[PDB]
Amino acid sequence: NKLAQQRFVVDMKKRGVPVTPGLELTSFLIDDATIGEWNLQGLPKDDLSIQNGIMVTNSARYPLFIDPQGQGQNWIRNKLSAITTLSHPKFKDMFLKYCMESGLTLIVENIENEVDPMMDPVLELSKEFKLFMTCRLANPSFSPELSAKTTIIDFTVTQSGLEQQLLGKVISKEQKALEDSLNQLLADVNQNQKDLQRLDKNLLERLINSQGNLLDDTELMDVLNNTKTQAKEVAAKLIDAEIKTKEINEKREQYRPVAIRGSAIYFTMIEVSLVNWMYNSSLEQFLKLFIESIDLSEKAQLPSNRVKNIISFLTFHVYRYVNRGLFEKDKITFILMMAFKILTTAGTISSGDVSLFLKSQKQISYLEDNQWLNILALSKPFFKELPDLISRSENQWRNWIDKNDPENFPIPDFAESINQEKEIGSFISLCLVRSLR
């Protein structure tokens, strides 16, 4: 959205042709009734899935999904169907002719950039036949012309939707009564949105059913009163919007930190796959682990304290599960990445400061050229403020640099209060420790 939108609107401004302020692409495209119908059919309730569903709806050509998780396969499995794999001797001959002469829709789920050539000229004559086919492994290398034929859609899950999905599943497993209240009020308020729609239908009926002699219909007075009555239940629904947006929200606020952590953990364990192949796993296994963790230790009493116990236990459970597959030289690294991905949201640690911690002399005379490289490394907030006479005191820190285990017993007193605070003081100590020693 961002790049493309600013791009198109700057084109329009330079062109000087007139355009309307505000995108709202989804709103004036599809009626929300079908949106809700899909949301019964398993479409994720969040924005990105909404545009994705639009994109499949337009169906300019047959599509092909980049599908790291499996949203599209399940969606099509439910959307209107409720299947035949590519690798099968019967598929190339039998399944083709059945679908092509009677329209069975012939789903495929094993594209790996390798096309049986007979797939193509079928692609480009029953007039009751469609075909949706999708990939599995992310980061495709599709040929230019495979982009020419079919539309491409990415269902790469964002963490943003991920925390809502985990939020729903935790509300399920921690106590079903929460879901009872949830789905009860949610069905009620959905039906009350439909009741506002019925108010609109009543207005339209009042306006064009008669199409003349509206005024001579003195029952129109009753009709006018009827309009008011419908608004009154909307007022109840309006009240419910508050009763929802606090109560369920706080029932969700007890858990939406958890979901945040869960999403963080998942997007950590994604990237180790790129660190080396064979550290690859689904979301589904992670889901089983998550639901289990809730079952394992979650409920004793004192629900807020048990939220803190989530944060204690889930992390260890998933952590150990991944360690069982890890190699020695990668043991320390996975835990390190987990720590950072935890702190990139709450503590808001700068990626610039992360790169400072990963990558990196006139002033000082005693220290070594091997050391002076590091002085210039640290030198280029208060890193560029305390290499002066403070650091160049040379009073007691000479012993310090000599002492083994510099961090622990002979602590730097260069910033004693900053090290004391500890909200970031760890990370500060570590930038120091790496740059110096």
Binding site: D11, N58, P117, M118, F142, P144, A148
Partner: protein, 385 residues
């Protein structure tokens, strides 16, 4: 030559040298042909018209030359497009004919026609070379066949297809063409066999498997008049000489490669004759003039509801701008994320289809709703009066 600037300097060289030699009418050439305006487009089928007197192909058009003009060029091109539509079932060929496309068809004609010629065509996918060559071959009466890679990828298909090709261009003596592309290569070896086909044309013991003499014996009746040894006699080996002459005279080879990837350059280095004998032609991506031309070709037939003077021209301009831009966005995505993205003019056409269709849909629907806004105005008016 890759960049248009390189072209501009060779034309400068040409004008300078023409002035150098032509030191006796130099002002006339400056007025007429050394001018950058279009001059002497040479073509064979446009200049003469069959006229369909008693039969459609009334007379073979004069063939040698044509003159400069663009109108009748496009009109006969569209004529011919309709013909190709009804010749081929399910042709499904919405070819848009703009100035550069016309020139490219002309160049394919120039190479295909010539006796003992062939031309390597380079360009990114979507440039249309594979689409253009079909018409370019149909006009030249040449038959065309492509190779199909079976479930088992092997070698015999090549051999039998080339045998049929020679016997079309040999014994029967018809005119043919060959349309290998990147899809028609699965290993190197195919390139070796074709390489020697460009060079010699004798396949070792494909035609000499106790068959060369029966096929040659099916041809000497033509030899009795063709070489015309006083209509008396002939010889045996000389018949094979005339046969290789015929087949190489009427076996044109049209190769169409990608410019990008890894394998193209060292494939060229592997086989010298490939880039050596064949002519070479570049297809640059479409510039803004072509895109606005396509935009107006598709907006003229689609400007039923979108009536606004002085804004249409800016509309077509801005649509071209959109396309040039999605090119740049593609480049940036690959640059940062190392994830491959591509584009084709087919998607631009599909985008115009979507524009037209959803515009008539939303125009009509939302304007029936706005007709209902006017029904509200009617209600207000009748109530007031």
């Amino acid at each position: 030559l890759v960049n248009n600037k390189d072209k501009d300097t060779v034309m400068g060289y040409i004008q300078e040298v023409s002035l150098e030699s032509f030191s006796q009418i130099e002002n006339e050439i400056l007025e007429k042909y050394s001018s950058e305006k279009t001059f002497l487009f040479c073509d064979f089928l446009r200049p003469d018209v069959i006229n369909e007197d008693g039969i459609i192909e009334e007379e073979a058009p004069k063939i040698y030359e044509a003159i400069d003009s663009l109108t009748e060029l496009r009109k006969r091109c569209n004529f011919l497009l309709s013909f190709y539509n009804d010749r081929n079932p399910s042709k499904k060929m919405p070819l848009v004919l703009f100035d550069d496309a016309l020139k490219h068809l002309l160049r394919i004609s120039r190479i295909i026609r010539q006796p003992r010629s062939s031309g390597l065509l380079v360009g990114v996918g979507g440039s249309g070379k594979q689409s253009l060559t079909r018409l370019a071959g149909f006009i030249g009466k040449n038959l065309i066949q492509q190779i199909i890679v079976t479930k088992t990828y092997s070698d015999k298909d090549l051999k039998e297809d080339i045998k049929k090709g020679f016997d079309d261009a040999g014994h029967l003596g018809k005119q043919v063409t060959f349309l290998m592309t990147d899809s028609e290569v699965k290993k190197e070896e195919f390139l070796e066999y074709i390489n020697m086909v460009l060079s010699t044309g004798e396949i070792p013991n494909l035609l000499a498997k106790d068959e060369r003499e029966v096929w040659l014996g099916d041809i000497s009746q033509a030899y009795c008049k063709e070489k015309n040894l006083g209509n008396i006699d002939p010889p045996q080996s000389e018949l094979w000489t005339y046969f290789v002459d015929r087949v190489r005279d009427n076996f044109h080879i049209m190769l169409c490669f990608s410019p990008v990837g890894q394998k193209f350059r060292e494939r060229a280095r592997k086989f010298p004759a490939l880039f050596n004998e064949c002519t070479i032609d570049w297809f640059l991506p479409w510039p803004e003039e072509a895109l606005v031309s396509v935009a107006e070709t598709f907006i003229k037939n689609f400007d039923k509801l979108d009536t606004k003077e002085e804004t249409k021209q800016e509309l077509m301009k801005h649509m071209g701008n959109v396309h040039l831009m999605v090119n740049e966005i593609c480049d940036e995505y690959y640059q940062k994320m190392r994830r491959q993205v591509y584009v084709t003019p087919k998607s631009f056409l599909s985008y115009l289809n979507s524009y037209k269709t959803l515009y008539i849909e939303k125009y009509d629907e939302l304007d029936q709703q706005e007709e209902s806004f006017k029904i509200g105005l009617n209600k207000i008016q009748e109530a007031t009066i």
